Design a protein around this ligand. Structure first.
Ligand SMILES: [Cl-]
Ligand SMILES: [Cl-]
Length: 162
């Protein structure tokens, strides 16, 4: 199992523009298109991302392409963030995946704010940090996902995804 498989489960796969839980235009595999309410803006952003006149519909391959860029972006953003890099560098690979997962979902910014958990995770005190991560809007809005991630994080295993 891996991050690709992992995130493919949390995000799903849609080929036609959709609104997420938060109500934003999105498509593919968790590829946020726009925070704006204009479906056109969304189409525009779509077209601009794909490089063609999509008319809000994409193909599997395109979705996948977005996904790769997005993952690769997440990995890179982590490595370039001073708050995060180190953390990342200390974790094993399973946990890294978890980290990546959250960055993918909430951005380098929204994640940099789990300072308290993160610093705990830095010390390797799993249970502690987990509970703390839970005391969050994140956790409250998308409990099931959040749970899969915090479990993974804490366990360093993939149990929550089988
Ligand atoms: Cl893009
Ligand atoms: Cl959820």
């Amino acid at each position: 199992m891996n991050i690709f498989e992992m995130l493919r489960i949390d995000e799903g796969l849609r080929l036609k523009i959709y609104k997420d839980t938060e109500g934003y235009y999105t498509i593919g595999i968790g590829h946020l298109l726009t925070k704006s309410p204009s479906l056109n803006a969304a189409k525009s952003e779509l077209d601009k991302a794909i490089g063609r006149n999509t008319n809000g519909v994409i193909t599997k391959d395109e979705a996948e392409k977005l996904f790769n860029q997005d993952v690769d972006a997440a990995v890179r953003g982590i490595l370039r963030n001073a708050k995060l890099k180190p953390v990342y560098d200390s974790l094993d690979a399973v946990r890294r995946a978890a980290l990546i997962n959250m960055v993918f979902q909430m951005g380098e910014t929204g994640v940099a704010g789990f300072t308290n958990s993160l610093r705990m995770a830095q010390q390797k005190r799993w249970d502690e940090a987990a509970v703390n991560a839970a005391k969050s809007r994140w956790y409250n809005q998308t409990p099931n996902r959040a749970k899969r991630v915090i479990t993974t994080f804490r366990t360093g295993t993939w149990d929550a995804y089988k």
